[PDB]
Structure formats: structure tokens, C-alpha cells
From a paper:
Crystals of the D132F variant were grown under conditions reported previously for crystallization of the apo form of the wild-type protein, and the structure was solved to 2.0 Å resolution by molecular replacement. Replacement of B-type channel residues with phenylalanine identified the D132F variant as having significantly decreased Phase 2 and 3 iron oxidation activities. The structure of the D132F variant confirms that the D132F substitution does not significantly change the overall structure of BFR or, most importantly, that of the dinuclear site where Phase 2 iron oxidation occurs. The structural alignments establish that the metal-free dinuclear iron sites of the D132F variant are not significantly different from those in the wild-type structure except for the position of His-130, which is known to adopt alternate conformations. Using this probe radius, it can be seen that although the B-type channels in the wild-type structure could provide a passage for iron from bulk solvent to the inner core, replacement of Asp-132 with phenylalanine sterically impedes access via this channel, consistent with the slower rate of iron core growth observed for the Phase 3 kinetics of the variant. The position of residue 132 is critical for the blockage of the B-type channel in the D132F variant because the side chain is located at the constricting point of the channel. Substitution of Asp-132 with asparagine removes a negative charge without introducing steric hindrance and is insufficient to decrease iron oxidation rates substantially. This result confirms that the large decrease in iron oxidation activity exhibited by the D132F variant results from steric hindrance of the channel and not from elimination of the negative charge of the aspartyl residue. An important conclusion from the decrease in the Phase 2 iron oxidation rate for the D132F variant is that a significant amount of iron normally enters the central cavity of BFR before entering the dinuclear site where the Phase 2 reaction occurs.
Residue numbers in the entry:
A (entry chain F), B (entry chain C), C (entry chain D), D (entry chain A), E (entry chain B), F (entry chain E), ...: 1 to 158
Write the structure that this text describes.
Amino acid sequence: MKGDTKVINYLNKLLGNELVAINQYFLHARMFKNWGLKRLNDVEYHESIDEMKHADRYIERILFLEGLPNLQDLGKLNIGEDVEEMLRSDLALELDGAKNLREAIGYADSVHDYVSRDMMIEILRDEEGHIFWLETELDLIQKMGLQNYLQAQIREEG
Amino acid sequence: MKGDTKVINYLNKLLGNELVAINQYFLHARMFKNWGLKRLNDVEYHESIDEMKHADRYIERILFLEGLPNLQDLGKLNIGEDVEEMLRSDLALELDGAKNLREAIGYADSVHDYVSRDMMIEILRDEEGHIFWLETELDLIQKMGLQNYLQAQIREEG
Amino acid sequence: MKGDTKVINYLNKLLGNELVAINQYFLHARMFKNWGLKRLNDVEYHESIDEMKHADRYIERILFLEGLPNLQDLGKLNIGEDVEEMLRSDLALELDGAKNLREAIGYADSVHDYVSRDMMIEILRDEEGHIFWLETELDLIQKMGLQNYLQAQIREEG
Amino acid sequence: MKGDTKVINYLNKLLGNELVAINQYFLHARMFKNWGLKRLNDVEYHESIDEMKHADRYIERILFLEGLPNLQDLGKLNIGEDVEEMLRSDLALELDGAKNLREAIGYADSVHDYVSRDMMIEILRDEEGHIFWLETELDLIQKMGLQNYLQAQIREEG
Amino acid sequence: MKGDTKVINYLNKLLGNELVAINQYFLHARMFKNWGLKRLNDVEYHESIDEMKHADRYIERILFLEGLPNLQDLGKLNIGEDVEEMLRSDLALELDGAKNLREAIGYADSVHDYVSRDMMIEILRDEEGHIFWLETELDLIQKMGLQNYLQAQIREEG
Amino acid sequence: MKGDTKVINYLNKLLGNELVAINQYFLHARMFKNWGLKRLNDVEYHESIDEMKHADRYIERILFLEGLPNLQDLGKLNIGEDVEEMLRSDLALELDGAKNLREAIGYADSVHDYVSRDMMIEILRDEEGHIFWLETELDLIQKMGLQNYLQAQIREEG
Amino acid sequence: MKGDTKVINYLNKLLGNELVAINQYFLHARMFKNWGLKRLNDVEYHESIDEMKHADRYIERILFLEGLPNLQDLGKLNIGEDVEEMLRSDLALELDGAKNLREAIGYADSVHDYVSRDMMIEILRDEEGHIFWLETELDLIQKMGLQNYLQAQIREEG
């Protein structure tokens, strides 16, 4: 079903955001894992998987709307070197991504692509949940100190 | 069954205490939650629920005794800005409420409303249990230091 | 995550509405219960519980957006003296609340806070379901007469 | 298998009756439901479903006999404005349809289409069961009065 | 609850679209069945059922909003004579309907009927899923040829 | 444990191959899905997942050996436009990847990194299995013709 | 089956390494246990058991190849006096052992004793897993501090 050209462009831009997040979160997860921070590995790895699910939704929607998914261009990753820097990088990435989503959601509404909009709002809802988690962790590092914080990550939280 | 007017006035005063506590504990709970202090959220939230149950008992008793439950007047909340201030505020609230409960229990006995008294003694027993928990938590903050204390709250206890 | 100030003000206004409904529905329920109208107590009590859930959603959303939930100011309750007056009062409360919600949902859209909007639309949907029930019960009082209507409430509808 | 042309015309006429009943009973059901008359909604909705099953049998039979099912022409609905008027309209509809069925069954026998006849007699048996329920309900409205009658519909009849 | 008059008119127009689709899909289904194309009968029949569910939602919403559901006027059916023509007819119907849905969704938003809007968006999401299926099947007819396509329909897919 | 620098360079090169395959196979998969070729979607999607697992093994091994995983550089994808072209592109990618693996396996042996070698041989064994599947499917397209081949993909194989 | 004499000498040397590790890890384990460091006792004890399993494989392989297993000569143990020193001693022991293993694996290949080689690669894979754990724990001591580190060992991890 032929979709709006600019909606398809937005979907490819958002897909682009997801491809960056997938790689950044996956590497951060395994860096966490390599440092023995099992709890952070677990959360970060599942964020990575969650972004794959988002990318999948963008890809299928683009194909349905008869556009061409772009998995070729990969934006800049920002891999941190310590736990706080890594989480702060994820947070900045999520905030950038949420700005893009808001714009796309607004535009999709204006050209009456309510199904694309509905999908993006669900994804945005997922992203704000991740933003909440990040902000909380970043504050906890300051509140309990880095040594306690790292100690709180070495066992899985199940 | 027409009750003693002053007993009903006491029950409305105690109900008023409960209405303040319900709101104060519920907001403190979600503030804890927003900070990632899942254990404190869990306890604080269930205290709020417990105060709803106490309010319910007062409301039903007042109606049975043919009085008019007053849910319209809401006393002063004292919302804290950090964990210790919030727990100290809850404790002061509990101690004030216990003073009121003691007065009512004495008065109900004097006019032979033993069923109202029996109800209030159970509630007082619940409140001293809460007072015990608060005093213990406040002492632990001092004994293990705030950083260790916050760390001990980020996972649910169960 | 720093939210829009006017959205946060809307959320606090809506929270204020919920705090009124919680108390109004709770007292109405126990009045129904005190009269032996078990069916009405059951529905009314669970509406009270449902408004607590709505308040909870507003409170968590406000805290996330870094605003201050206001549980201190309690609006006017309108407690009825007979079944029809109580239900009509609940209905007026719901209709007033729905106007406020519609306005907030519109504005949330205009500043691209689609997650707050999504939350509020779910709540509005709950409220219109409650309005449907109220309108139905009020009509049934007139159609079967008050004596039959009351008789129909004295046993639980499981 | 090439059927009798006039038999096919009868089946299309009967299908036409079913299409009317489907819509009339479906709307009547949801009007009942909207008024809180759950028992009537339940029965009326299932009659609508049963008329769909009848329509289905006609459609399949017509196609087998190599005729063209007519779903395009929709006869007059008679939507009532109150419960008694709605049930009396359903009853008149059933009686008109039973007349049509009797004529078709007689003709089908006459041209030796015994399988179409057998199908139609099963449907006629279903309809007389519905006519029985309607006559009963209409009599009960008079015998117990409308207020009692409506009270008896507000709960599901297990 | 008195709704917006034009929203109600939209809902009746959409209900009208559904009434056409119910009949068109039901007849197409049984034509498929009569040809031995069991897989197409199964999908097409369940589309008809799905459109009945959509109609039900419109009817109940209209009644809640105190309007009058119109089940009397039936728009033009376009019954195909071979498989490709039938599927293309369904597809044109779905596309026409999606246009109406988009228009209604935009208008409901403008008068703050967010619950009617939310219902319609769910329905639009369903229809685009049906549009996807239709486009796929039509392409498969071209890609594998009609003889292979028909062979692929004669057993149930499950 | 500080690894051999050139081994780490090989692992990053092989990771790079995996990153291309992950994206190429995922897009091909959903293209198959969009075409209704359910069997091909299922296989292609699971190949994509298998390459993610391989990438995961490289990333963890690089980190253990104290190198820096490179997820930033993404090589050329070769997305096909029809089924045969897509499978041939996958096959060329796999053959290129196997050449790189053979080189790396030889080199790792020469510097006594037997654990890296052992890991790569397992991965090579997986890739040759995929190569077998691709070559088989490509031959089958020619042997049964494209129309029969496409028909054989529209149902899941399980 | 008469084996290569030099391979057998390698197997006896590696067996000697295992005999040192078995005793060193067992004593470190019970020293940990005596200090109340239950998590470390658990891991260290199971490493000792794993080295017994490795020794067992060497002994059986040596006897099969018709050599004489040497369990008489025991190399130098390096028992640490505090947790960090003990772990660093284990790590140095593992690294020395891996050097010997790589050499033996290389030589087994040159004389085509591929089964001895295959056994040794599995053991090497085990040892690098142990090296990973050791490096991680040593880094965690510095990152969270010894006091937090010790606190993190007093309960079993399972």
C-alpha cells in the first residue's frame, strides 16, 4: 500500500536511530559483562534486543508502505569507557531519539497515517521507560557512590 | 444504632488522621519508587494501603453509629525532600496519631463503647508496629551511613 | 526527564479530580453498604479503587517529568443523601472530569507529549465506561421504580 | 448441480428475510444492552447469530444449485422504540417469515427438491421456537407488569 | 452521554461500510468454499466475522452517544466472478473504507472525542492488515500463476 | 588476558562480516515476509539471529583479549530485488566470509590461540551448513521452475 | 596403543601442573571458608575439582598411550596470605599452565596426535574461563574496594 514519501523518510531515519542503539547497547552490555557487572549486562542486553524489535517494526512498516529500508548507513556510536560515561551516552542517544520520534509522530498525524503514528507512540512509550531507568541509575551512582554502585551490579537481579 | 456523639467526633478526627497519612505515604512511596528505592516504595505503599483499611473501618463504624463521615477536610501533609526527612515526617505523623488514638480509646471506654474501643486498639497496635519499623530504619541510616542505606533499598525484600 | 510545565499543571489538576472522586466514591460505597445495597457497594467501591489507580498514574507521571504532585488541596465533595442523588452526583463529577481530560489530551498533543496523552486517553476510556454505567442505573431507577431498583441491589452480582 | 429456478428464487427470498432479521435482531440486542437489560441482550444477540446461520445455509444451498445469492437487496427493518414494541416487531417478522417458509417447503416438495425442503423444515422448527419465546415474553410483560419485567432482565440468565 | 452529532454521522457512515463488507466477504467466502478453495473460504469468512465485530463496536458507540444506528441502508456490493476479481473488489472496498476512517479519525480528534478516535484507529490498524493480505495474495497470483495459486488454496492452512 | 594483536584484528574483521550479514539477512527476511514467502522469511530470519550469535562470540572474545570491538564500520550490503538474486547475494557473502575465516583460523593456530581457533571453526561449520542450504535452494529454483519454487514457500515448514 | 614419547612427556608435565593447582586451589578454598568468604570458597573449591578432572584425563590418556603417569613429583605451591594475594597467585599459576598447554598442543599437532591435542584444547578452554574469572575478581577488588569486595563474598551466589 503506497505510503506517504516523507513518512517513509521519517521511518528510515528512526530505523537509523535504532541501528545505532542496537550496536551501542550490545557493546556496552558485553563491556559490562566483561567487567563482571552481571546486572547491567542483563538490562543493557535486553535494551539492545528491544531496539531490534523496534527496528523490525520500522522495517516491516516501510516495506508495507512500499519504501526501501535503509540498513546500510550507520550513524555515529558513542561508546563510553567507564560505567557512568556509558550510561550517560545511552541517555543522550535516547533523548535525541525521542526528539526525532516526536517530530515523526506529529507529521504522521498531519498526513493521516494514524497506523504509523500509533506504532511510533508505542515505541516512544518504550523509550521513555528506558530514559527513566537511565536517569535513576545515574542518580544512584551519585547517591550511593561508585564503589557501592558497582558492588550492586555483580549479581543478577531476578 | 445511634452512637455516642463524642465517640463519633473522635472517629472523624481519627479518620482525618488516616486521610492525611494515606496521601503522605502514597506520595512518599512513589517518590521512593522514582528514585529507584524499590524496597522503600514497597513498604511505604503498603503502609498507605493499611491506612486506607483503617479509614474504611472508621467510615463503616461512623455510618453504623449513624454519624456523618467527614472526608472533606484534609489536614496538613508534610512531604519530605530526602529519604531521612520523609521517614522522620512519617514518624512524627504516627506519633501524633497515636496520641489521638490513646485519647479516643480512653473516652470510648468511659461511655461503654467497647466495640469502638476494641477496633481502635487493633489500629493502635498496627501503628506501633509502623513506629517500630520507622525508628529502626532511621537508626540504620545513622549506623551504616546513608550511602550503604540507599544501596540496601534498591532491590525488593522478599 | 524535564516535562512541559503546563502539561504538569494539567496532570496536577486531573490528579486533584481523582482525589475528589476517590473520597466521594468511597463514602458513597460504604453508605450503600450500610443500607444493605450490596451490589451498589461492590461497584462503587471498585470505582473508588479504579480512581486510586488513575491517581497513581498521574503521580508517577508527574514525578517522572520532575514536577511536584499536589495531594494537599482537596476539591469539593458532593455527597448525596439517597441513592439517586448520589449516583447523579457521581455522574456530574465524571462529566466535569471528562471535560478537563479532553482539554489536557488536546494540549499534550500540541506540545508533543504523546506518552502523557496516551495515558490520559486510556483513563478517559475508563471514565466513559463509568459514565455509561451511571446513566444506565439512573434510567433503570426511573423505568422499574425505586422499590424494584433497591430490591435489585441487595444481593451481590458475581 | 443445476437446481429448480423457482426453488432458487424461494431460497433468495428466504435469504432476504434472514438478512432483515439479522440486522433487526442485532440492533434490538444492543439497544437492550445499552439499556442495561442483559438477559434480553443475550437472547436477542443469539437470535441474530442463529439467523446468520440460516442465511449461511441458504447461501451455500443456492451456490450448490448454481444460482446467485442476493445479499444486495435489504428489506424494511422495523426497529421498535421500547421493549414491548421491539419484541412485537420481532414477532411480526417471524410470523411473516414462517408464512414464506411454509410456501417454499410446499413448492420444494412439489418439484422433488427434498433436500432443500428438509433444510427449510429444520429452519422453520427453529423459528417456531423463537415465536414461542416471543409470545411468552410478551405475555409476561402484561402479567407481571413492565416494571417487574424490566427488573427481571438486568441480570444474565445462566 | 450525548455525543457530537457529526461524529455520530461518521460512525453511521463507517457502520455502513462495514455492512457492505460483511455481506461481500461472506458471499465471496462461500463462493470460494463452493469452488473447493478451502483456505480462501477460511480467511474470507473470518474477515466477514471481523467486520461484524467492527460493526458491533460502531453500533454500541453510537447508542452510547445517543444516536440512531442505521442498519437499513445498504451500499453497493461488488461481487466478483473469479478469484482475482473478487480479491481486487475486496481490496478496493478496504481502500475506500480506510479513506473514510482517516477522515473520521481527524474529525473526532478536532472535537475531542478521543475514545471514538481510539476505537477507529484500532479498526484502521485491522483494515491495513487485511489490505496487506490482499495485496500479497494478488501478487502471488501473478508470481506463481493462477493454476499453482488455486492448487495452494484447496487445503486448510493450519 | 592480553591477546595477540593480529588475532584481535582478525576477530574485528570477522565481526565486520557478521554485522553485514546480520543486516543483509534481516532485510532479506522481511522482504520475503512482505512477499508472503513465509518459509523463506523463517529461515532467513533465523540465519540473521545465528549471525548475531556469532557476532556476540567475537565481541566477547575481543573484550576478553583486551581489544576494542568495532561495531562502527559497516561494510557494503548487497540487497537483491528478487528471490534468486537475494539468495545468490547471501551465497556470495557466505563464500567471502568463509575465506576470511580460513585465513584467521590458520593465523590463530600459528600464534597458539587455540581457543580463538576452536571458536572460529565452530562458526565456519555453521556457515558451510548455510552455504549448503543456499546452494540447494538455488538449484531447486532451476529444477522446479520459479513458479513452483515460490509456491513451495508460502507455508511455514515445521 | 603406544604413543609418542615426547607427547607423553608433555602430558606428564601438564599433569604435574594440575597436581600443583589441585592442592593450591583446595587450600585457598578452605582458607576462604575459614574466613567466612562462602562465595569464594564455593568457586575455589569447584576449580580444585575441575583440575582433578583435568588430571584424570591426563592420567587415563598417559596409560592408554602406555606411558607412566607421574604423581610423585609435586611442584612448588604459592599459598597467599590474603585474598588478593591468593587470587593473583592462582592467576600466575593459570598463565604458566596455559603457556605449557599451548606448547604441548602445538607439538601434538606436529606428530599427528590429534586426539591428545583435542583433549588439551578443551582443557585450555576451561583454563581461559578460569583466567577470565580471576581477572574479573581482581579488577573488582580495586574498583569497589576491599571492604565492599569482602562483603560481597560472605553469602553463596546461587
